[PDB]
Ligand binder design. Structure first.
Ligand SMILES: Nc1nc2c(ncn2[C@@H]2O[C@H](COP(=O)(O)O[C@@H]3[C@H](O)[C@@H](COP(=O)(O)OP(=O)(O)OP(=O)(O)O)O[C@H]3n3cnc4c(=O)[nH]c(N)nc43)[C@@H](O)[C@H]2O)c(=O)[nH]1
Ligand SMILES: Nc1nc2c(ncn2[C@@H]2O[C@H](COP(=O)(O)O[C@@H]3[C@H](O)[C@@H](COP(=O)(O)OP(=O)(O)OP(=O)(O)O)O[C@H]3n3cnc4c(=O)[nH]c(N)nc43)[C@@H](O)[C@H]2O)c(=O)[nH]1
Ligand SMILES: [Mg+2]
Ligand SMILES: [Mg+2]
Ligand SMILES: [Mg+2]
Ligand SMILES: [Mg+2]
Ligand SMILES: [Zn+2]
Ligand SMILES: [Zn+2]
Lengths: 337, 353
DNA sequence: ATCTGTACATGTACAGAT
DNA sequence: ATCTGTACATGTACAGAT
DNA sequence: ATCTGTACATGTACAGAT
DNA sequence: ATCTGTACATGTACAGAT
């Protein structure tokens, strides 16, 4: 049932191999061509594919080109929590200016590639990414995400975030908060605003997700945490393909929701493979409550509400609410298309 | 009962403070002196190990263990006749004067280390501290501090190799069902340590033989000992794993101070035994505080079985039997067996002394 | 003037004290 | 139940060296 | 400073066992 | 129908060499 849907969603070794070989060539070449104001940049693979929760096909890859910058002063962009003003001379560090040159370089280098069919997607404003379209006969997008790496204490807006104490614990949390934090040129001084990114932390969580250290290891018990994330991701993807009303929603909304549910139900036994249906259903119920109450706090930045009126209109939330409720109460017909 | 014994065993903030201030001064000073221009041990780094740093030191803060570890790149090991734990180490390198052809003499290096320490201790005139007479079979330079209370510090010379652990340890550290594969892989990516075995057993290659140490790994385990990541943390449930270790440690210490028949036994025997029991019973719920008696009792039963069958494998080095006929005579094991059995069946009268 | 090994600055888990 | 000392990990300032 | 080599975790694929 | 064991594949951390 849901088992058979997961069968459909499961990526194939063949496609994984063919997608990765081509993606690695291109990324490797871009990374080499920086190191240039971006000399010192380092590769950090992030998102679904590297978290092992990519569904349906290996067709979207996320990579951070992160740059150590010496200590910086952050000023919070009117109390939003996530957005800040912060070699680099000819870039207050303007996100747009830095991104533009990064982008310019990438585009130049992509022209030189003659063994891969690969172009650079038209810039979407409010995106920190330089997005590559690779046409291995299969279509593959690669987001190249410029990031500043700061080694200081995380900003105070994150003090109450990452509430993993009863789940992953205080030692894990303390160690995670000793890692650097990332600023990505997502814009909101609109064109000089950077946004916090904790993709590195999210990756660790995805791959170290149990209360027991052996969760999902070879001498441990399998849980259904990732399978639930997959299923919820598929529901949204399927709905989004059908209904343009849902343009405003994205997989990060689902990922954030499940982070909260993983905190609510920390016990591995609450995510038993035998309870896949219960688990998926409680995840749906939780997501509906986020929509109803117009509240889905960033896991790392509690005061940043991803479901505020400002980012998503009430009508969109009500639309998605009715569509989820329908699928839930009719055996998820959309999983069969 | 056992709760009240643990109350007795509990160290005091006052004593901890006074012991540590004095110990840290001395160690700090020794570490700085190893870093002189001339010194063959320049580059040595401090690593605090053992009970005190594991929070299983009992009764008083009067014994401290510190490793002065030295990175030794490009090192070749030969196992000393299939014993698992013992190795010859091989290669103006600072260690010139310790080489015998390509063989690194443990006793030569230890002697100079020792000589330096002794010199430096003479210069300290604000702490009453001497160097203990060298005990054969020991890798340690042992400091006797009168604070006024008596405090020993073992300064343990160690070679640090960053390569993959020796094959004798391949099947060791069997934490897969307890701490897991990721923890084990990460632990085995840390360096391994060689300390001078240095005894005067008249044997071949004595004085060039070194022994493995995994005190760094043992420390991590002691302080990250649950199957759940929250074991013993502020948003988790307390277990009685450490409390059992303490109680077993106390039994041995008490018996050892009374009976010279037990000279051959040491706290490392009980630490190794409990490592095996922690592997046997990996679930935190098998170490519930409410079940302290059961848990301690099963630990005793396990240890008795080790004695009876003359078998207690090193946790890291499975083929190395700490309870072999060599090392420990049958009679000693049978003596300790009867003493443990007695205490167990008569309310542990020795806990009341 | 720049660089750097050493010491300090900051933060928190663990466990004892209150 | 809260508070507090020690240990320990990571970042950074700077006198003395280059 | 970069690069390769090694080891093992996280996946998928599929046959034989349960 | 699921589970277990083996093979086959990719990602990733870090040591030692260059
Ligand atoms: N891959 C993808 N792309 C999506 C999704 N919805 C919309 N898009 C495309 O993105 C642009 C830009 O619009 P945003 O709303 O800014 O989209 C971002 C981000 O692209 C998506 C998630 O993308 P991802 O690849 O990072 O996600 P993974 O975790 O790898 O999972 P995947 O399997 O789906 O790839 O979410 C939006 N977003 C908002 N805030 C964040 C944030 O803090 N982090 C991240 N990582 N993403 C965030 C649109 O024009 C559209 O074309 C979608 O579900 N997936
Ligand atoms: N502290 C101590 N000292 C003891 C014990 N039994 C005997 N001794 C004294 O040690 C020497 C003789 O040397 P060994 O027989 O080699 O004794 C070693 C080692 O000293 C002890 C354990 O001591 P520790 O300080 O390392 O122990 P902790 O884990 O910190 O616990 P603690 O509370 O008791 O201090 O065991 C012997 N040993 C054999 N094999 C090993 C090994 O692989 N590692 C370690 N660490 N020790 C090992 C004489 O002076 C004698 O009187 C004893 O129980 N405790
Ligand atoms: Mg993605
Ligand atoms: Mg993306
Ligand atoms: Mg000790
Ligand atoms: Mg000792
Ligand atoms: Zn799991
Ligand atoms: Zn515990």
């Amino acid at each position: 049932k849901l088992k058979k849907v997961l069968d459909k969603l499961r990526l194939k070794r063949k496609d994984i191999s063919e997608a990765a070989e081509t993606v690695n060539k291109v990324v490797e070449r871009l990374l080499r061509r920086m190191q240039s104001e971006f000399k010192g940049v380092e590769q950090l693979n992030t998102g679904s594919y590297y978290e092992h929760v990519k569904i349906s096909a290996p067709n979207e890859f996320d990579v951070m080109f992160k740059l150590e910058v010496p200590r910086i002063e952050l000023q919070e962009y009117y109390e939003t929590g996530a957005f800040y003003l912060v070699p680099l001379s000819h870039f207050v560090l303007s996100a747009t200016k830095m991104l533009s040159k990064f982008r310019k370089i990438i585009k130049e280098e992509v022209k030189e590639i003659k063994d891969i069919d690969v172009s650079v997607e038209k810039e979407k404003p409010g995106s920190p990414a330089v997005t590559l379209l690779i046409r291995n006969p299969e279509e593959i997008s690669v987001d190249i995400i410029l990031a500043l790496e700061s080694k200081g204490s995380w900003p105070i807006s994150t003090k109450e975030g990452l509430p993993i104490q009863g789940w992953l614990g205080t030692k894990v949390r303390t160690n995670l908060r000793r890692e650097p934090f990332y600023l990505v040129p997502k814009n909101a001084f609109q064109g000089e605003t950077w946004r916090l990114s904790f993709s590195h932390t999210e990756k660790y969580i995805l791959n170290n997700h149990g209360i027991e250290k052996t969760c999902c290891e070879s001498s441990g018990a399998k849980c259904c945490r990732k399978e639930c994330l997959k299923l919820m991701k598929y529901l949204l993807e399927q709905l989004k393909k059908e209904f343009q009303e849902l343009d405003a929603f994205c997989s990060y909304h689902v990922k954030t929701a499940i982070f909260h549910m993983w905190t609510q139900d920390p016990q591995d036994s609450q995510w038993d493979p035998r309870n896949l249906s219960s688990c998926f259903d409680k995840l749906l119920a939780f997501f509906l409550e986020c929509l109803r109450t117009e509240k889905l706090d960033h896991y790392f930045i509690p005061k940043f509400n991803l479901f505020s009126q400002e980012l998503i209109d009430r009508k969109s939330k009500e639309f998605l609410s009715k569509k989820i409720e329908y699928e839930r109460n009719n055996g998820f017909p959309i999983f069969d298309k």
